[PDB]
Amino acid sequence: CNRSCEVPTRLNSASLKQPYITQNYFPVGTVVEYECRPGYRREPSLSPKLTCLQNLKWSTAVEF
Amino acid sequence: GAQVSTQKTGAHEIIHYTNINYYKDAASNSANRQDFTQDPGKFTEPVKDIMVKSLPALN
Amino acid sequence: GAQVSTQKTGAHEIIHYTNINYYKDAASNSANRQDFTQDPGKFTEPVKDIMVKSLPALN
Amino acid sequence: GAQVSTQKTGAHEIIHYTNINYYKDAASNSANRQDFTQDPGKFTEPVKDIMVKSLPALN
Amino acid sequence: VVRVADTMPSGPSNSESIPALTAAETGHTSQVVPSDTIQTRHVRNFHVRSESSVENFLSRSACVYIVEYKTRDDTPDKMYDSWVINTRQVAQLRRKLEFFTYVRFDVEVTFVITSVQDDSTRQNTDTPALTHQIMYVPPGGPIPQAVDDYNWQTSTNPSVFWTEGNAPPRMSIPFMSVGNAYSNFYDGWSHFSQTGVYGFNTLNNMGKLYFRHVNDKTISPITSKVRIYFKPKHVKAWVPRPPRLCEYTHKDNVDFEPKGVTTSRTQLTISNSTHVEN
Amino acid sequence: VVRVADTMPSGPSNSESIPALTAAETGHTSQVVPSDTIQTRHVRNFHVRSESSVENFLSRSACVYIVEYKTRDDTPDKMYDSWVINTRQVAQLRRKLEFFTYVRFDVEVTFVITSVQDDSTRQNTDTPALTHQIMYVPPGGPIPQAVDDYNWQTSTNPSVFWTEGNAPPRMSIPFMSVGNAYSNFYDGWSHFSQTGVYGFNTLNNMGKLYFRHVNDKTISPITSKVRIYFKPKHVKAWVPRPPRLCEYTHKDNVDFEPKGVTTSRTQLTISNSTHVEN
Amino acid sequence: GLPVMNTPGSNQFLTSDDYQSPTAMPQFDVTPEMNIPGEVKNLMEIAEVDSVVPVNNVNENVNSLEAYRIPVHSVTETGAQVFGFTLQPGADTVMERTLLGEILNYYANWSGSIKLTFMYCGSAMATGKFLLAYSPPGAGVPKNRREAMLGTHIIWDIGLQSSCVLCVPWISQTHYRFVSKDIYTDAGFITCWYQTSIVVPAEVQNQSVILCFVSACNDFSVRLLRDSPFVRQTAFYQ
Amino acid sequence: GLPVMNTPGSNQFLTSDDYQSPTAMPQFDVTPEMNIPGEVKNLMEIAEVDSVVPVNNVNENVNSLEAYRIPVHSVTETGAQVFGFTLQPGADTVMERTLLGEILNYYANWSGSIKLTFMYCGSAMATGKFLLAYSPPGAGVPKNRREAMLGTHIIWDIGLQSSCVLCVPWISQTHYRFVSKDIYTDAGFITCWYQTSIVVPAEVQNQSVILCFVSACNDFSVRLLRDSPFVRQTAFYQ
Amino acid sequence: GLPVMNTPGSNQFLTSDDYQSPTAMPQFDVTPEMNIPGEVKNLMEIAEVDSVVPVNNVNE
Amino acid sequence: SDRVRSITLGNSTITTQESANVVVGYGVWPDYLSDEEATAEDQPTQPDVATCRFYTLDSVSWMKESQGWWWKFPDALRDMGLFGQNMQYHYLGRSGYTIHVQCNASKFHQGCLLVVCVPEAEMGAANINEKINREHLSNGEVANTFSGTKSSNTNDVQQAVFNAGMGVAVGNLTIFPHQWINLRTNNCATIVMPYINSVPMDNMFRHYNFTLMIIPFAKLDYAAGSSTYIPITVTVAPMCAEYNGLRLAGHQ
């Protein structure tokens, strides 16, 4: 029963991959990864990853 | 830096008001509801070879 | 002890406003949003032996 | 019956403010926070036969 | 604007002029300018001793006191309050005023009034806005003994009414003293035979404040607390005095526990640090 | 009023005057007027570089922070809050201020205070108007440790009281710095041996704010949040600086993830569109 | 007692105000102002400085110094081309994150001419001529060299002065254009053409590099303060 | 009816105000002002007065008059030392509760030079020389007499004028230092050295005492009103 | 502190007002005014122009 | 011709025959601190020409795949004769600088360098929330080297050329006083920086004043048979230096 984050930030052009979309309990330092939703394509100048910080809030995720 | 104008008043029987502008922009000022000029010579009489109104203006 | 300036207005078609300072400290005053001067000669042209722009400026 | 003074401002780089007294009693007025004079000659150097500071001041 | 004094340039010296050798035995502070012992340069100094003046040191809204009273109590004595006016129950403004031996000033007075709904069974009410009365009684006048006393009718005594939600009450008060200045310290007695009460308590004599709710008795208890904020202004002060070392114990005397001079050290010399390692 | 420069008329040219051929190798931006390469006409231009000045660019009511605290909590630490003052926890005003390396300004400060009734069983109350206290503590002063601490008595520290429903609080603050200007960037250490902390964190030293409800403990929890809005004014700035590319990560350093230069393309040349059809 | 009527807009908080407020630290002694070199009074003093344009941003060279390197070499057929982009200093991907484009993204209107400077960073034995051209909108992008020489072009001869200036004037129907994309304020196209060739002697490297700069003229102006579309924050930085 | 807009900061109570208020006792007759000798207009008139420094505060002499007595005697080897402390008039434990330090603890910035006066309270047959030295920060504390004579020192010969003045000038990079402790505004060190010895005749007491004073010069200034860290109250005094 | 009495009609919104208000876009640079032909200053310049009268409006 | 320039300081002289225009500062020339903006009270040490002279740093080798080098200049001149000695005995100091960067090749060579002086170039760390060692920021007279890819050495600076250590676009560094050494036509890299700080004097060790960076935008490229070893030499002078607050020997 450690500290956990919320559900990661719902983006309107990306969805989670499939180890991360089902499971809860995100500890600190956890990286999650997003994939392009259908039908979208990747922007190569941005890395689609989110780290959860010490204050139990994710990093800024805008539009991948 | 005040300015004193006349108030809109009746006829056949010159009261003044005072005005100060408080803000730095001119879009802030109160509306100019005291300009009564007109010139209906571009819509009426919009012709060339200006008529006389007593002549027949033809032939 | 008032001071009267000009309002920011449009071009191609001098309205004044008045100002009084109420507090004893100068940090209290309203911001100076009407200084439009510039001098971009220390960032552009930041050289020695000032060029002419019509000569080749080399050899 | 207003009075115009200078505002407290920085050095190395005279702004005025205006003041009106509204009440009939002088205990009502705002505090005098702009008197910067001093005279530390009654606490330091509080002696008789005033010294020179270059002489030994004894014998 | 009176700037601080400047530093003048100097050079080498070999003469019978000795500014460093002084006599501190003559009650006299030496006035050695730093250009007299070392060789200095020209410093045009632009600093102002502005915020160290006695007005700029004392004219802040300090305090004096907190006052509690209720609007529905079974005992009729906790329904209103009172306070004999001194400036010596809070240590910060007391120490600041006791930098000097005599003072003379006007007072700007502000009240900060806050009300809390007390605990009861019937705690869900619809209460209208509370209204407060602060009545000042000059020294010798008649005192109220209840909240429905007819001595609150303030025909000559100055009183202030306040409604919940507005700006706080503030009023100015002139130099209300019978001597030429106020006394922070009085070394004497009340009776001519050198008996009676000793110290500054003979000279307080300011009258007292009285506090109540103007409303009638409510159906649920609400406790109100008003904080009297004193703020001096138009200040003059005479014959200065060392800052107090020890802690205050009471409001009517200067009695103290003997405290040492300063914080201790472990040795009389300094050196570099002997902690952990390189 | 300083208008922008105008366009002068020109004609054909065949001479040894070459304004297009320059040397960009000499750190020098060429100043080619458009009347030197093409034949132009007389344009009397009436535009003003007004809203691009540093005052008109920075003097907007930006922010710095959101602050939360309750009026009835079992833990005594969530009943008040505090904030060490920097301008580097929100990226918009941080990036705008970090266009320049040195700045000097006065600050106009506004608070926006909103309270929400928390969830409890006894949620139907009759609550009077909440009153807030915002106390500023200069660098080095004493800090409160509870809501009923006697360090809140603000005798020398400047504090602001506010009642629910009024205009928001706003006060002006002078140039509160020990150097000649503020530092957006500091390339150095705190200790002389080039150890310690690195960067701009050595020079912050602004003191901190403290927030509480002036009322006593209510019978139901209400959480209040106050937003500190910073707004600079009377601005001067020195030695400009490129805009930041990467995203900020922390408030005490300049550490970043390496981001590419711009958005990509698919080829190095342009052409007409190859979508659907005529 | 003075008769006063409160007007609408009382007790609000507007962000762009110019009012007066009381000082919390009264009669405070502000430190003396010092002459620090390099004072900025207007942000348009910054935008008139040259900064290199990441033209070669083709899908991988963004994460390198190759974004700024424009390729040029000897071509087996003239009448050719070098590059081209769309004149949108803050909407187009090429000059988006430039100094002029990042000053220009805090605004919403712009006006005035734009300079372009091309430093040829090749050998001193290499020589050649280019066609630097601007095409005002209304037709499409030119597809030949003979369609691009109908525009506003200059022919650049590489020599002892290794850089040239293409000045893009203000050809518009409105006084202002939008710094974002709308179809009503289209601004034209910038293309560069192999005109002749790159001619090198033996034992000299053929493939060289052009660097492109951009800045603003002395009639450039920006108008509507907005927030930049590039700042993004999710949580507070701590 | 006058059109009025209330601005933010209305109906607040700020502690450092300069407004006007009505009088509760109107037309009150204030008693005549009298010329009492010894008027203070500025607190800096007080700080320029000498007050004795409790230098010998070594762990028990605080609760006695021995805190003010600095020991001096004849030493079997010269090149020695007498004492030393850190120049922090309000952070250092030595001159913390002094007159200058207690005026100085209601503030948060200070500036200007500082005087130090050393009254030799020994016999009239005793004689000797001292090395009174100030060391600006950046290096450590000096550990020799030859490291301390690289600073700002004066050699004090004891004679018919029994006291000397060490003047500590203002050597800083900022105009102000903090009256509390930060590493950015370190101020240096004050040490005193047996230079030669104490030389006495027969039947004269060897062990004598130096008294140290401190005050401020005519360029001393304090800036930020705060509350002093030495006042402490738990309940109301009654 | 100035003694002020609020009069009736305070804090209302009347449609035909002539008051002053603060600008939300301060120091805004308005585009230059152009001479467009055909300016109307008074609506009575329009009413003095002939327009045809639908007299034969008989039911279809 | 204006391609030739002589620069004389102390007992040292630099002659160049392929200068383009000697680049010099923000428009301001270095000068001693006036006594109307001064803070410290004792007499400054304007030492002599014994500090106001040229010092040569180490040479870095420009290869085909080199990325960029940097220095920290109050700290890089810390063992350079009596200048560095004054740094070790005074607390406060102050100087402008004449930086002259030299590099030469033949006419069959190609490649272009950017030489920028950046005030207050606060570098960012390779791993994010972690300290940086002083040896990775400033290594004396020895240059630290940027990379192409992101770096992840522990307690080290994030060294990508396309972010320049600080986190900006590297094509935007032409806002600072700079030049280019195009091997076609240049060697004239002066930047005569004035004293730039927010205080009238400052400590030489605790503060870094600015950062020299030499970044090749058009990389070095030559045909087979030309000289493959091309050094780059950086020479630096203090101007109008003065010192204040003399005490014991400082922090090495």
Ligand SMILES: CCCCCCCCCCCCC/C=C/[C@H](O)[C@H](N)CO
């Ligand atoms: C209805 C509102 C009236 C408020 C009355 C409250 C204050 C009236 C009493 C005068 C205050 C005197 C201030 C303190 C006096 C001296 O400083 C002390 N004795 C210290 O020596």
Ligand SMILES: CCCCCCCCCCCCC/C=C/[C@H](O)[C@H](N)CO
């Ligand atoms: C009781 C109300 C008092 C409110 C106090 C809040 C603000 C007081 C602190 C001063 C604000 C300084 C503004 C920011 C400073 C510089 O710009 C930053 N260091 C950026 O370099």
